[PDB]
């Protein structure tokens, strides 16, 4: 069918002329930090990536992709499922069923963390976060789960995908190119390539274009994926607007333009300037490294004699003839060093690295100033905020739909949504502060006038806990009272007849022989 | 915070709780007025005080009562060998042990 | 001074605390030993891929090969493995919540607080599985 | 067998490799267990009492 | 190596001078080859029947190099491994390794798309070391004129 | 898409903005509840036992 | 209604009456703009510094022709006081602008 589009190859080729602004930024932007991270398309096995003269960009990227990772994808749970609490009160008999629902929400949030960690999503997100700093865009495809086998996700680094979005935030169409070799192509595709005609080599590389365009009708995406000239049979799929396995991440997203400029090309000009200093300081040390012996030619010493002498020889000559050429950029080496130590100082706050110990003399201070290192957290925070909506949430949503279809998760009843909280958190700390307040009420527990039944409610209201099942109701208090009595009833009762029976059983010698026969024992002891 | 500051003031009144002359029923109101808490349900009222007195007794009534007949029944149930066989049949158990 | 500056910016690239041959005095406290602690992030970036590449394959191969030689029980087709850096999460989440229960020891005898419910909520919050955690009616 | 490997004039690469292959080893292959087997918990609830 | 009994069974490493793999621009591996040159005496039994089966006597210490080939079968995406001595394959070499569980796994660090092997970690900073050496070569040589 | 944004020669404005948009955020939209609903207390006493 | 509309304009440093409100960081905008003109000059003073020009005294003996084919340790003709290097002299001036 026509499908209301030209063809995925073409869509990829018309809009490949829109990556070329961002792509030639990232090729420049990875050149200064770490050249192995965003290779130019021409680059191949042969290309050697010369290290930059400065090593702050290589430092301040791993020290920022890692901090971002810890913050965004903490090992400790980083999504939780909030049920809408008032609509949970209506559809349910309070209060035991409410936390029973939140156990099912604590059920799911552990299974996803057991799904993310057991499919190496921590790996390909850290490869994503390194692309999000240098390049600024990555597409992460969450392959449909097929069985409980190993199923890793895939990242396309803005050299293998194309998206097109609006001035408005929503995505219109996506294209990705992967070039899977003939042997490795999935079955249904091999029937289409052979169905096109002509034999192929086992290692010949076939490139498959998907096309994830927004259907005009229904705002549900359509995805058809295409090999060589035309579409594979069975490629057609429809992804709803809120749950599609292809989600493009962009950092520093700017209106409206389709991809988002990288984080480390914010300070790219400044790095580029740091490099031109650190290129010159090293080259000043190389003129220094050469050892030239300037012989004064109006003198007596002849190097001919100086160069066949042994360890201790007496040689003719004056010492003031032999001088050595030395570099004189001294009051100049300190100019270019103190600026390079000032540019590294103002990039080490821009990146989340505490600044290099090579610094001003002494001057190290206390925890107070380690609190300035603590203040580096705000700087960490601004960059990860967008990342959450862009990456954190989509991944969670896609996972939740995909686990319903493979029945690895219970079908949660259409009303639970998720905040990627940095993780309760608020449910733990608000229990605890209030629980200490109740001990503050331990001395007054026996007090005649203070309404301890009310103060425990007020402190709760104030911390903000839900109350509801927190206070024993009257029925429950009555039950508690009987249970202390039924304990002492069972305790004194079982101690009564056991003293009661065994006193009058063993009483009298014969009755004693009759009592042992009821168990099964003999008369003699 | 206004709950808490005042709640510490009440512990400052723990040593004097048994004092004969200090109106501890009034000092707990004044500290409250001063912190600025709403009072109102803070102080047990007459009905509540009576109920609390009663509950300590109904606790000791249920506690000593349930310990009485359980010592009361089981002493005279297991008293005598035959009455003992009759008592085990009411639960459902056999005569031999 | 250039060779002491190039060794300084390779000693952070490698996971070695930089050579003591350095600027005079200037040694500081645990706070700055926390910068040595921050060397862990740099350690982390390089080992992440290594995990998928080496850690997991070795474990998978070992698991199949131990089934064929009967040195392992045939695990029933549904268990998968995360190379966690090791529980870990099963130990620490037990423990934090277990301290919270002692925080509830003074109030154990309190007439109004539903201690049967607070022990459930703290559990829900730490994130432990509950399920067998609370004695049921029969067990009580 | 004959080749003699001349030591480099700098000894940071010889330092910063053993000090990085060892740290990587401790981190990746800790003596303490470094794999654990997660059973799928919801499918474990279904097939079991 | 496949466990054979509860005896001692160490694994083996081939350091990019003894193996060859070929993978796609996509992440998956197509074919692997390794060369080990086990001497005649040490060659495992079934291989000695193939080398003698080729013909001609061998010295006890003459070194024979055995190529394995771990190519991805076009059919079924299950690997096939046949290993070969001199000109042709040993009897019994054939084995089939599923895609997710094969005893030959190539590790690569700093894996880069798509190219088959991955550039080393310490050649990230290789330029910088190489520059450190040219200083430390000069400081030592200045102490020798001294 | 083409425009390249040259970094300013100083990096205090880039520093002092993220360090001020973040502090403002923590202060204004704290994770801990930052609105509460006051009922008019005297009119709540009248309409209620 | 007047009190509940989904479009609410936020303005910071709201000034009477004018419709939008001047930004916070253009309070100190003049001052930043002045900081930039210093930090542009300090960096450009380090770039003249970065260039390494070998000023040979042309009334001397040393000839750079010999100095530039010498190996690591060669004995070469000449006086050391002929070869000097041009260096930037804004020193008591780099500390004013810093």
The DSSP-derived string for chain B is: -HHHHHHHHHHHTSGGGG-SSS-HHHHHHHHHHHHT---SSSB--HHHHHHHHHHHHHHHHHHHHHHHHHHHHHHHHSSSHHHHHHHHHHHT--S--
Q: How far is C-alpha A56 from the chain's CA centre? A: 23
Q: How many CB atoms lie within 10 A of CB A421?
A: 16
CA distance linking residue G39 with residue G97, whole number of Å: 9
The 8-class DSSP code of residue A211 comes to E
With H, G, I as helix, E, B as strand and everything else as coil, classify residue A340: helix
Dihedral, CA atoms, C10, C14, C17, C22, nearest 10 degrees? -10
Asked whether the beta carbons of A420 and A392 are under 8 A apart, the reply is: yes
| Closest in B7, B63, B96 to A485, CB measured | B63
Q: Which residues contact A489 (CB under 8 A, 6 or more apart)?
A: B66, B67, B70
3-state secondary structure A138-199: EEEECCCCCCCCCCCCEEECCCCEEEEECCCCCEEEEEEEECCECCCCCHHHHHHHHHHCCC
| Tokens, residue B8 | 């510490």
Burial (CB count within 10 angstroms: exposed 0-12, middle 13-18, buried 19+), residue A252 = middle
What DSSP letter does each residue of A405-417 carry, written as one string? HTTSS----S-EE
Residue of B nearest to A520 (CA): B97
Spatial CA neighbour of A326 closest among A371, A302, A292: A292
**Chain A interface includes G65 (CB < 8 A):** no
Asked whether the beta carbons of A185 and E30 are under 8 A apart, the reply is: no
Spatial CA neighbour of A43 closest among A131, A132, A159: A159
CA distance linking residue A258 with residue A17, whole number of Å: 13
Q: How many CB atoms lie within 10 A of CB E74?
A: 13
Name the H helices within chain E.
45-54, 126-145
State the nearest Cα–Cα gap between F42 and chain A, in angstroms: 19
What DSSP letter does each residue of A312-336 carry, written as one string? T----S-TTTEEE-----HHHHHHH
- Dump strand ranges (E) for E14-138: 19-23, 29-36, 66-69, 79-85, 88-89, 95-97
CA distance linking residue C59 with residue D36, whole number of Å: 10
The 8-class DSSP code of residue A275 comes to H
User: Order of strands, edge to edge, in the sheet holding A293-295?
Assistant: A322-324, A293-295, G75-77
User: Order of strands, edge to edge, in the sheet holding A154-156?
Assistant: A154-156, A137-141, A246-250
Q: Which residues contact B74 (CB under 8 A, 6 or more apart)?
A: A493, A494, A496, A497, A500
Which residue's entry shows tokens 């029969």? C138
Q: Which residues contact D16 (CB under 8 A, 6 or more apart)?
A: C10, C11, C13, C14, C15, C16, E122
| Tokens, residue E132 | 């450190």
Q: How far is C-alpha C122 from the chain's CA centre? A: 20
Q: Do A178 and E25 touch (CB under 8 A)?
A: yes
Q: Are strands A246-250 and E19-23 parallel, antiparallel or unpaired?
A: unpaired
**Chain G interface includes E99 (CB < 8 A):** no
Q: What is the CA radius of gyration of chain E?
A: 22
Asked whether the beta carbons of C6 and E131 are under 8 A apart, the reply is: yes
Burial (CB count within 10 angstroms: exposed 0-12, middle 13-18, buried 19+), residue A48 = exposed
**Chain E interface includes C6 (CB < 8 A):** yes
Q: How far is C-alpha A474 from the chain's CA centre? A: 48
CA distance linking residue A9 with residue A230, whole number of Å: 9
Dihedral, CA atoms, A425, A430, A436, A442, nearest 10 degrees? -140
User: E-chain residues within 8 Å CB-CB of D20?
Assistant: 121-122
Q: Do C15 and D17 touch (CB under 8 A)?
A: no
Q: How distant, in Å, are the alpha carbons of A145, B13, B28, E51 from that of B43?
A: 62, 15, 8, 101
Q: What sign results for the dihedral spanned by CA atoms A331, A337, A339, A341?
A: negative
CA distance linking residue B10 with residue A447, whole number of Å: 9
CA distance linking residue G21 with residue C42, whole number of Å: 44
Name the H helices within A201-302.
268-289
| Tokens, residue A437 | 């307040």
CA distance linking residue E111 with residue E106, whole number of Å: 11
Phi/psi at A20 (5° precision): -50, -30
Phi/psi at E31 (5° precision): -145, 150
3-state secondary structure C4-37: HHHHHHHCCCCCCCCCCCCCCCCCCCHHHHHHHH
**Chain A interface includes F32 (CB < 8 A):** yes
Asked whether the beta carbons of A305 and A316 are under 8 A apart, the reply is: yes
Angle at G47 between CA G46 and CA G48, to 5 degrees: 95
* Helices and strands in chain E: count of H runs, count of E runs: 2, 6
Q: Between chain D and chain B, are at least 3 CB pairs below 8 A?
A: no
Burial (CB count within 10 angstroms: exposed 0-12, middle 13-18, buried 19+), residue A142 = buried
Q: Are strands G75-77 and A293-295 parallel, antiparallel or unpaired?
A: parallel
Burial C29-65 (b: 16+ CB within 10 A, else e): eebbeebeebbebbbbbbbbbbbbbbbbbbebbbbeb
CA distance linking residue A415 with residue G15, whole number of Å: 44
Q: How many CB atoms lie within 10 A of CB D5?
A: 5
Resolution in Å equals 3.4
| Tokens, residue A343 | 């540019």
Asked whether the beta carbons of A20 and A7 are under 8 A apart, the reply is: no
Strand partners, A171: A165
Q: Do A184 and E30 touch (CB under 8 A)?
A: yes
Angle at F22 between CA F17 and CA F24, to 5 degrees: 95
State the nearest Cα–Cα gap between F10 and chain G, in angstroms: 5
CA distance linking residue A301 with residue A319, whole number of Å: 8
Q: List residues in chain C that are followed by a break over 2.5 Å (C to N).
A: 85
Which residue in A332, A336, A342, A343 has the most chain G C-beta atoms within 10 A of its own C-beta, making it the best mutation to test that interface? A332
Asked whether the beta carbons of A10 and A4 are under 8 A apart, the reply is: no
3-class SS shares of chain G: helix, strand, coil, % to 5 = 35, 10, 55
Asked whether the beta carbons of B33 and B9 are under 8 A apart, the reply is: no
Burial (CB count within 10 angstroms: exposed 0-12, middle 13-18, buried 19+), residue A303 = middle
Which residue's entry shows tokens 């940071």? D12
Q: How many CB atoms lie within 10 A of CB B80?
A: 12
Asked whether the beta carbons of A173 and A214 are under 8 A apart, the reply is: yes
Name the H helices within chain D.
15-28, 41-46
| Tokens, residue A89 | 């009160």
User: D-chain residues within 8 Å CB-CB of C46?
Assistant: 24
| Tokens, residue C133 | 């955690």
Residue of A nearest to E27 (CA): A180
Which residue in D9, D10, D12, D44 has the most chain C C-beta atoms within 10 A of its own C-beta, making it the best mutation to test that interface? D12
- Structure determination technique employed: cryo-EM
| Tokens, residue A1 | 């069918």
**H/E element holding C125?**
helix C115-126
Burial G9-43 (b: 16+ CB within 10 A, else e): eeeeeeeeeeeeeeeeeeeeeeebeebeeebeebb
**Chain C interface includes D25 (CB < 8 A):** no
Q: How distant, in Å, are the alpha carbons of A214, A341, E73 from that of E77?
A: 34, 56, 6
Asked whether the beta carbons of A343 and F9 are under 8 A apart, the reply is: no
Q: How far is C-alpha A369 from the chain's CA centre? A: 28
Asked whether the beta carbons of D36 and C91 are under 8 A apart, the reply is: no
With H, G, I as helix, E, B as strand and everything else as coil, classify residue E30: strand
| Closest in F9, F16, F20 to G40, CB measured | F9
Q: Do D10 and E122 touch (CB under 8 A)?
A: no
Which residue's entry shows tokens 């490493």? E13
Burial E9-22 (b: 16+ CB within 10 A, else e): eeeeeeeeeebebe
Q: Angle between the B2-12 and A426-440 helix axes, to the nearest 10 degrees? A: 30
Q: What sign results for the dihedral spanned by CA atoms A330, A334, A339, A340?
A: positive
Spatial CA neighbour of A254 closest among A241, A246, A240, A266: A266
**H/E element holding G29?**
helix G29-50
Instruction: Residue count of chain C, please give it.
Output: 140
Burial (CB count within 10 angstroms: exposed 0-12, middle 13-18, buried 19+), residue F13 = middle
With H, G, I as helix, E, B as strand and everything else as coil, classify residue A40: coil
Return the partners of chain C (3 or more C-beta pairs < 8 Å): A, D, E
Asked whether the beta carbons of C82 and C51 are under 8 A apart, the reply is: no
CA distance linking residue D13 with residue E130, whole number of Å: 10
Phi/psi at E16 (5° precision): 50, 45
CA distance linking residue E77 with residue C116, whole number of Å: 56
Q: How distant, in Å, are the alpha carbons of A290, E108, G31, G57 from that of G67?
A: 10, 47, 50, 14
CA distance linking residue C139 with residue E12, whole number of Å: 55
| Tokens, residue A236 | 């057609």
Q: How many CB atoms lie within 10 A of CB A46?
A: 6
Dihedral, CA atoms, D35, D40, D44, D45, nearest 10 degrees? 130
Dihedral, CA atoms, A391, A396, A402, A408, nearest 10 degrees? 150
Q: How distant, in Å, are the alpha carbons of A150, E19, E67, E69, E94 from that of E51?
A: 41, 22, 13, 18, 17
Q: Angle between the C115-126 and A426-440 helix axes, to the nearest 10 degrees? A: 150
Phi/psi at A162 (5° precision): -145, 130
Dihedral, CA atoms, C9, C11, C15, C16, nearest 10 degrees? -160
Asked whether the beta carbons of G46 and G34 are under 8 A apart, the reply is: no
Residue of A nearest to C10 (CA): A55
The 8-class DSSP code of residue A19 comes to H
Spatial CA neighbour of A174 closest among A183, A163, A182, A185: A163
Phi-psi region at A321: left, alpha or beta (left = phi > 0; alpha = psi -120 to 50): alpha
Peptide bond into A486 cis (omega under 30): no
Which residue's entry shows tokens 């949430």? A393
What DSSP letter does each residue of A43-79 carry, written as one string? --SS---PPPS--STTHHHHHHHHHHHHHHS-SS---
């Amino acid at each position: 069918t026509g499908l209301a589009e030209d063809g995925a190859k073409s869509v990829y080729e018309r809009l490949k002329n829109d990556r070329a602004p961002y792509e030639t930024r990232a090729q420049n932007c990875a050149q200064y930090t770490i050249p192995s991270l965003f290779p130019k398309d021409s680059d191949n096995a042969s290309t050697d990536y010369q290290t930059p003269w400065q090593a702050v960009g290589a430092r301040g990227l791993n020290n920022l992709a890692s901090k971002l990772m810890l913050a965004l994808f903490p090992m400790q749970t980083w999504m939780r499922l909030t049920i809408s609490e008032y609509e949970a009160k209506q559809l349910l008999s309070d209060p035991d069923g409410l936390a029973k629902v939140d156990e099912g929400l604590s059920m799911v949030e552990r299974i996803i963390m057991n799904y993310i960690e057991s499919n190496s999503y921590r790996v390909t997100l850290f490869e994503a976060l390194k692309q999000l700093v240098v390049a600024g865009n990555v597409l992460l495809y969450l392959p449909e789960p097929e069985g409980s086998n190993y199923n890793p996700m895939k990242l396309y680094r803005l050299s293998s995908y194309v998206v097109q979005r609006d001035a408005f935030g929503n995505v219109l169409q996506m294209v990705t190119r992967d070039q899977i070799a003939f042997g490795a192509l999935p079955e249904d595709i091999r029937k289409a390539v052979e169905g096109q005609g002509g034999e192929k080599k086992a290692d010949e590389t076939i490139d498959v274009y998907t096309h994830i365009y927004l259907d005009e009708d229904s705002g549900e995406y359509l995805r058809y994926e295409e090999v060589e000239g035309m579409e594979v049979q069975g490629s057609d799929g429809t992804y709803p607007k809120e749950a599609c396995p292809y989600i493009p991440i962009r950092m520093v997203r700017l209106d409206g333009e389709s991809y988002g400029r990288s984080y480390i090309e914010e300070y790219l000009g400044d790095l580029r300037s740091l490099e031109n200093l650190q290129e010159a300081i090293v080259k000043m040390s190389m003129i220094s490294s050469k050892v030239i012996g300037l012989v004064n030619p109006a003198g007596i010493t002849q190097p001919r004699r100086l160069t066949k002498a042994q360890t201790g020889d007496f040689v003719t000559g004056r010492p003031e003839d032999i001088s050595f050429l030395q570099l004189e950029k001294q009051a100049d080496f300190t100019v270019a060093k103190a600026v390079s130590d000032a540019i590294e100082a103002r990039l080490s706050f821009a990146f989340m690295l505490n600044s290099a110990v090579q610094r001003t003399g002494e001057r190290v201070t206390a925890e107070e100033i380690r609190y300035v290192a603590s203040e580096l957290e705000d700087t960490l925070g601004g960059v990860y905020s967008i990342l959450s909506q862009e990456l954190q949430l989509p991944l969670v949503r896609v996972l939740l739909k995909q686990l319903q279809a493979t029945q690895q998760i219970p079908e949660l009843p259409k009303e639970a949504v998720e905040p990627t909280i940095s993780g309760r958190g608020q449910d733990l700390d608000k229990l605890e502060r209030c629980v200490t307040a109740w001990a503050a009420l331990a001395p007054m527990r026996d007090d005649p006038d203070i309404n301890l039944a009310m103060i425990k409610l007020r402190i709760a209201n104030a911390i903000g806990i839900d109350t509801s099942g927190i206070l024993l109701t009257e029925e429950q208090k009555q039950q508690k009272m009987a249970q202390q009595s039924m304990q002492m009833g069972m305790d004194n009762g079982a101690a009564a007849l056991a003293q009661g029976m065994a006193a009058q059983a063993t009483a009298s010698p014969e009755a004693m022989a009759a009592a042992a026969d009821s168990v099964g024992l003999q008369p003699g002891i």
